[PDB]
């Protein structure tokens, strides 16, 4: 039509950037700056193409937070409603029980490299 549409490089995943060994520095370095907060990894579904995306890949979440209060945060800086469809993964899960601490969620999903994987969505299907 009238656009023209740019392809552009792929999109490369926060692990595809990092390696394995840089990541678990990182975050042995903020944990031991920032005891109370949880290095989180928030990215967009590879191939979604309803949402936007985030400013940053990188977040630190305060302990005391549950999963309903973070996804609403992440959906607020999505700048969506709460029409929207949006869903979240945590370490590849379906999102599990909404009033589940922050912290306790991290003990269980954390990835081998010290950080908590979440994936965003406007399908279950992913």
């Known amino acids: 039509d009238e656009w023209e549409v ?3 490089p792929s999109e490369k995943t926060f692990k595809q950037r990092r390696t394995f060994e840089q990541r678990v520095e990182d975050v042995r370095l903020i944990r031991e700056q920032h005891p109370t907060k949880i290095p989180v990894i928030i990215e967009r579904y590879k191939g979604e193409k309803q949402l936007p995306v985030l400013d940053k890949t990188k977040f630190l979440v305060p302990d005391h937070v549950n999963m309903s209060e973070l996804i609403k945060i992440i959906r607020r800086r999505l700048q969506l ?12 899960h379906s999102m599990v029980s ?3 601490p922050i912290s306790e969620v991290y003990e269980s999903e954390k990835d081998e490299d010290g950080f908590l994987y979440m994936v ?3 399908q279950e299907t992913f």
Do not use: E, K
Request: net charge neutral; aromatic share 14%.
């Open 6 to 8: 740019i392809g552009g």
């Open 81 to 92: 409603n709460a029409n929207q469809a949006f869903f979240l993964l945590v370490n590849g």
């Open 98 to 100: 909404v009033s589940t």
């Open 120 to 122: 965003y969505a406007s």
